[PDB]
Amino acid sequence: AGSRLETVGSVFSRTRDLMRAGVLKEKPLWYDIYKAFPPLREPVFRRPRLRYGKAKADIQDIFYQEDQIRAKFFATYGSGQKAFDLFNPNFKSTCQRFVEKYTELQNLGETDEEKLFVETGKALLAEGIILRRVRE
Amino acid sequence: YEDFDTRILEVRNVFNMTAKEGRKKSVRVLVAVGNGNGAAGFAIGKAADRGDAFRKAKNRAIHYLHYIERYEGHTIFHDISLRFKRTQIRMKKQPRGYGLRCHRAIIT
Amino acid sequence: GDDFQSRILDTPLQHSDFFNVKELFSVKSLFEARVHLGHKAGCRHRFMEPYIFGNRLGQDIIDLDQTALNLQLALNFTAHVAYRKGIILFVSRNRQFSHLIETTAQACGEYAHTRYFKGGLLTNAQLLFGPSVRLPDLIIFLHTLNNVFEPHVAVRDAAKMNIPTVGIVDTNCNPCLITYPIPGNDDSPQAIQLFCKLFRTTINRAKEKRRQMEALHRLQSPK
Amino acid sequence: HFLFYTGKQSYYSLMHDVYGKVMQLEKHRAESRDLIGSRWLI
Amino acid sequence: VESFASMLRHSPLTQLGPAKDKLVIGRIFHIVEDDLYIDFGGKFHCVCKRPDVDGEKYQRGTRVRLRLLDLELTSRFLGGTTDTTILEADAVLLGLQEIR
Ligand SMILES: [Mg+2]
Numbered sequence: 325a326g327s328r329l330e331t332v333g334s335v336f337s338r339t340r341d342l343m344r345a346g347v348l349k350e351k352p353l354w355y356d357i358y359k360a361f362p363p364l365r366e367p368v369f370r371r372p373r374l375r376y377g378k379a380k381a382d383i384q385d386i387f388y389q390e391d392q393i394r395a396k397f398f399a400t401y402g403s404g405q406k407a408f409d410l411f412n413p414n415f416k417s418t419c420q421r422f423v424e425k426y427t428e429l430q431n432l433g434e435t436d437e438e439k440l441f442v443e444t445g446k447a448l449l450a451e452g453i454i455l456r457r458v459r460e
Numbered sequence: 461y462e463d464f465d466t467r468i469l470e471v472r473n474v475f476n477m478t479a480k481e482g483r484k485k486s487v488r489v490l491v492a493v494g495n496g497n498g499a500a501g502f503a504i505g506k507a508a509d510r511g512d513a514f515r516k517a518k519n520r521a522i523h524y525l526h527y528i529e530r531y532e533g534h535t536i537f538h539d540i541s542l543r544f545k546r547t548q549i550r551m552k553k554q555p556r557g558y559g560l561r562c563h564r565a566i567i568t
Numbered sequence: 569g570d571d572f573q574s575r576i577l578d579t580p581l582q583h584s585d586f587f588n589v590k591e592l593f594s595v596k597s598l599f600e601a602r603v604h605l606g607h608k609a610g611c612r613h614r615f616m617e618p619y620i621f622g623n624r625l626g627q628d629i630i631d632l633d634q635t636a637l638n639l640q641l642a643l644n645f646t647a648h649v650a651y652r653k654g655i656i657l658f659v660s661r662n663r664q665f666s667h668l669i670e671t672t673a674q675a676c677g678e679y680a681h682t683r684y685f686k687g688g689l690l691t692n693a694q695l696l697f698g699p700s701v702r703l704p705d706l707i708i709f710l711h712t713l714n715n716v717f718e719p720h721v722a723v724r725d726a727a728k729m730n731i732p733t734v735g736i737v738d739t740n741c742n743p744c745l746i747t748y749p750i751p752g753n754d755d756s757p758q759a760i761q762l763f764c765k766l767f768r769t770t771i772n773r774a775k776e777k778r779r780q781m782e783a784l785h786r787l788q789s790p791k
Numbered sequence: 792h793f794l795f796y797t798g799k800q801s802y803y804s805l806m807h808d809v810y811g812k813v814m815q816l817e818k819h820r821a822e823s824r825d826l827i828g829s830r831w832l833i
Numbered sequence: 834v835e836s837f838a839s840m841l842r843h844s845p846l847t848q849l850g851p852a853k854d855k856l857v858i859g860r861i862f863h864i865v866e867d868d869l870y871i872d873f874g875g876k877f878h879c880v881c882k883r884p885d886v887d888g889e890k891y892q893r894g895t896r897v898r899l900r901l902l903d904l905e906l907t908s909r910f911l912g913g914t915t916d917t918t919i920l921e922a923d924a925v926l927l928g929l930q931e932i933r
Contacts (some may be wrong), residue, residue, distance in 0.1 A: 325461060328691070330727035332526070335747060339730050341527030345499030346463065354705055354732050356860045356919050357648040358747075360581045365748045367727075372614055374914070380619055383609070386624040388646055388842055407856040407898050407930070410874025413600065420848050452529045599840045605876040608907045610916030621841070625851055627876070627904060632837040645816070658795055667810055674793045681796045683803055696798065704796070717918075740915070755920060756876055757862075816862075818893070 331369040336362070393423045396441060402458050418453055463495045466518045467568045469502070471510070484508075491517040492568065493525070501525040572785040580651060587651070587773050589643040592766055595632050598639075601762040603752040604630045606739030616739045629740040635751050642734045642748035643770045650774035654705030657681060657721050658767075661714045663717060663762050669710055671672075672753065672764040676771040679704065679724075685714075697758045700725075709735030711754055712746065716765035723770075736763055844876065852901040858930055859899050861891060870887060873924060875904045890929055899924040901921035 325347045327338040336358050342348040370415055375381075397419050404418025428442045434440050470490040477483050487510045494500030501524040505517025529555065531537045540551040551562075560567045580586045581786050598604065606612075606620065606628035621631035651746060660669050666682040673680030673732040682691075686696065695703050709727050712735045714720050719742055726733050727745050735746040743749035753759040794800040814828070849855060852875075857879055860872035867883040869891055879899065883891050891897070902923040907916040 327525050327527075328523045328728040329526065330724055330745065334712070335727060335730040335732055340497075342525065342730075345525060345916075346495060347461075347499065347525060352705070352730075353648055353652045353654050354645075356581060357645055357652075360504060361584075361644050363645075363748050365636060365687065365912050366518050367733075367745055368742045369727075370615065372742065373892055375614075379486065381612075381614075383617060384611075384622040385631060386622040386841070386847075390848070391850065394848075398615065398850060403855050405856075408845065408849055409858045410849070411858070412845070413864070415845050417845075423707070432596055439768060450665075595837050596835065596840065597843075602876065604837075604841070605846075606918060607876075607907050607918060610907055610909055611918050616925060621837070624841075629841065632840075667807070667814070668805055668923075670794070677793075679793050679796055681794075683797050683799075686798055689798070692843065697795075756825075756843075757872075780897065 336366075344448050362458045390423045390427075393426050394419055396437075397422050400441075400457055405454065405456070418455075421451075421453070422448060461522060463497075464493050464499075464522065465496070466491055466493050466521070468514075469565055469568065471513075474506075487513040489513040489517045490522055493518070493521045498530060499525050499527050569789070572789060573753065575785055576594045576781050577652065579781075580648060581779075585640075585644065587647040587770070587777060589642060589770055589773075590643060591726075592643065592769055593636070593639060593762075595636050598632050598635060598752070598762070601615070601758040602756045603635060603637070603759045604632050605628050605753045605756065605759075611740040613675070613742055614738050615742055615744055616737065619737075619743075619749075620739055627646055630739065630751050630753065636750070638768075639752075641749050642750050643766060644733055645732070645748055646708065646767060647770050647774040649675075650771040651778050653778070655702065656706045656708060656771065658708050658710060659685075659703040659720065660709065660711040660753075661685075661720060662711045662760075663715070668760065668764060674769050676768045677775065678771060685721050687721065689693065690722065690729050690731070704731060706731045707731055709733055709746065710760060710763060712737055712741045712743075751782070835902040852904050855901045856927075857901055857924070859897050859901050859924070861897065862894050864893060866892075869926070871899065871924070871926070873899055873901065873922070875901075876915060877905050877920060879924040880924040881924065882887055882926065884926065887929065896930045898927040898930050914933050 327342055330336065333341070336355070338354060339352060343351070360447055406418055409415045422444055425447050425450070426440050429440050429443055434443070442447075445455055468489060470488075470492055470554060472488045474486050474488050475483050476486065484496055486508055487565040488506045489510070490502065490504050491514070492500060492502040501521045503517045503521035504514045505515070505520060507516055518560055529537055534556060536551060536553050538553055542548070562563050582779060606622070608626050608630055609623050612628055612748045619630055619634050621629040623629070646656065656676070658669050658673045658678065660666070660682050668702070669682050670680045680715040689696060693703055707722060709720060709723065712720055712723055723733065723735070723745050732747040733745070734748045735743070735750065736748045736752055737743040737746060738752070741754075743751075749765075752763070792800045792804065792805050793803045847858075857873045859871035859879070861869050862872050862878070863870035869881050869883055870878050871881060872878050902925070904921050904922055905918060906921055907918040909916045
């Protein structure tokens with residue numbers, strides 16, 4: 325004898341009811357644990373529905389301010405000929421060094437984007453990084 | 461489950477056409493169970509014999525026990541209006557001594 | 569006598585983190601294992617949007633702050649269940665991680681079902697296994713979807729039997745019926761290996777604590 | 792047995808061992824006809 | 834303790850930007866016949882074919898070079914409510930990485 329109705333209430337509420345009913349004489353061992361440390365949300369059934377009309381989701385597109393700089397770098401020089409290593413947690417790519425220098429110049433007070441892009445290219449050239457302005 | 465009582469709500473003789481037997485008959489029984497103390501459930505049992513359909517529904521319904529909240533143990537907490545498919549139900553909370561004034565099935 | 573049994577079973581519930589599961593993981597540790605990587609926006613479930621930090625160029629990112637909070641609760645619940653000698657069943661249908669998940673269950677001392685799930689396993693347990701079969705007290709769903717991209721049958725069937733479920737839910741899954749959802753990446757080997765380690769260390773700590781708690785209280789009875 | 796709830800604890804316990812053996816051989820790295828005139832058990 | 838927001842901003846995957854036609858380093862973790870399963874640091878691995886040249890060199894653990902295309906191959910089809918995903922990434926194997 326139980327409550328095999330998984331669309332009404334939750335395992336805890338249905339277990340609470342079966343004990344009040346008089347059918348379940350011994351508490352389950354997991355019951356008191358749930359009472360003291362319940363989940364953040366109650367596990368109740370909800371039927372998924374489609375959005376209709378003008379309803380829209382609430383997910384923020386993740387765009388940092390560096391992306392404006394990174395977008396220009398990829399369009400002008402492409403991806404650095406050195407290969408990305410996504411296993412090194414502290415990897416510094418050719419593009420990320422460009423963005424670090426572009427930021428440094430911008431802190432000095434340069435306001436023109438054209439000035440910051442050609443000056444950063446010169447600084448990396450002095451560093452020795454091989455930047456190819458590949459229009460192709 | 462001696463504290464639970466079972467009541468029949470419908471007994472129907474449905475038919476399925478089969479090539480071997482032509483018209484074949486099954487007994488579809490709808491039953492409800494309850495302990496008279498807030499816990500109740502229902503199920504449908506189908507079989508070729510009525511006695512078997514009674515057992516199937518009776519033991520199946522004990523697995524679907526709702527717990528119904530009673531105000532002071534004698535009435536619902538508030539008026540309840542709902543439509544289930546094309547059936548409309550309008551329940552009303554009443555004082556003591558009013559008795560059950562409902563569809564015979566609802567009384568059961 | 570009776571006091572000692574009450575002490576063993578009732579004292580653990582008077583502390584917020586009796587087993588100190590907080591130390592096992594950290595937001596940084598989860599980020600190393602790529603637990604914040606979700607499916608593309610097209611594959612998103614509507615009930616997962618609460619847990620999604622955002623969309624990084626089409627790929628949903630899972631907030632690792634909600635994951636840390638939820639994971640703390642799920643590990644805490646899994647430890648108290650293990651402490652009280654409950655049966656824990658690991659369930660997954662991902663075949664890349666089938667051997668790892670079966671190896672974890674064996675290490676913990678618990679049970680794993682990573683194979684084709686027979687209809688009625690829990691709703692018809694007596695017929696399938698025998699009259700007095702004891703069902704699991706907790707089911708941990710490392711994967712909540714089967715290989716046809718549908719909810720694992722045991723999610724609905726475990727609710728029907730009123731069994732709590734600790735499940736790893738990704739951005740394309742349905743967490744509504746999971747008692748303790750853990751939002752996180754379910755596809756990457758580094759994420760699954762981290763979760764398997766956490767559940768195994770947690771379960772072993774809870775079992776060890778029970779032995780120590782019993783020895784201390786038992787010794788007091790003569791002493 | 793940890794695979795009790797699978798319903799075929801002994802079939803899957805055997806398939807667990809043979810899959811683990813295969814992984815160690817594949818990770819770690821002659822004629823295979825060590826036995827002849829033999830059949831797989833029915 | 835660094836916040837998750839900080840970790841994501843400075844993450845190598847966040848720096849990569851769009852993953853189309855980017856160059857990345859992968860590692861072979863599983864080989865089935867002439868099919869190489871390569872982990873390039875993303876959510877899903879890619880599966881490439883063993884090159885004819887230096888085929889014996891591509892063994893498990895070998896670090897290689899790749900040109901990413903998609904991090905996950907997904908597409909909604911006629912009458913579908915969700916995107917169908919094959920749980921796999923798309924990349925073009927370019928060759929072994931020089932250890933240097
Ligand atoms: Mg996934």
